Amino acid sequence: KLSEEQQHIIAILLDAHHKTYDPTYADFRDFRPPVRMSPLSMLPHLADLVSYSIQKVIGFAKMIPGFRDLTSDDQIVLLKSSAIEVIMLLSNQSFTMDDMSWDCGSQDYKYDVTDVSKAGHTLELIEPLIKFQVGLKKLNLHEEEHVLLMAICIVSPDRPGVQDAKLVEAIQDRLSNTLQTYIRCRHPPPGSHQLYAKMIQKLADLRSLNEEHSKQYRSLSFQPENSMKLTPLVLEVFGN
């Protein structure tokens, strides 16, 4: 029931993801070193990690079938609002339920709740973020489903500032229908049970995390002394 077009969409998104996500973590050495001891000792490092990841997200989004037909303004709006959400999704790959941390290849680059706290965040964000990573892990998504969910996240019509909401929606709907059909034809039960609805709930969860993250970000970037330790790309995309 998966058309040639739908199978093409999946192969494109899979390749786009393979070309833009590095599970070897080879670049983490390029980042300002992580500091654990502490007034925001982990902010420079994780700011760099995020800035690096924003660049990966942009590269993925450009390869989403249809994305490039939007106004420059609308591509920008969708990436600005989605970037943190997609990075949270992306990060599930290094998240381990063994100890509820993001484990990126080594000890220096294994991040837990206290590291995220040392980046300026409170439990208001960190607790639901962990709960999110756990719930997402528990879905045990196919990689096919993972990349579709990321693409659907980016092309949402209700994003703030969206101009051509009509065109954004048609782009998304084609992806949504690809995902729904994929699960039916390709995800065997019981894992498939309500899987689509569950995945959309993770996008609602992401909207909520986006909102809290923005609050804590404005509070963090309120003092220029902290704003100083971010990167130019982070300041541009998350605001300042």
Partner: peptide, 11 residues
């Protein structure tokens, strides 16, 4: 619009 780096990365 006043996102130089974002726009350049998207081109």
């Amino acid at each position: 619009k006043n996102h130089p780096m974002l726009m350049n990365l998207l081109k």
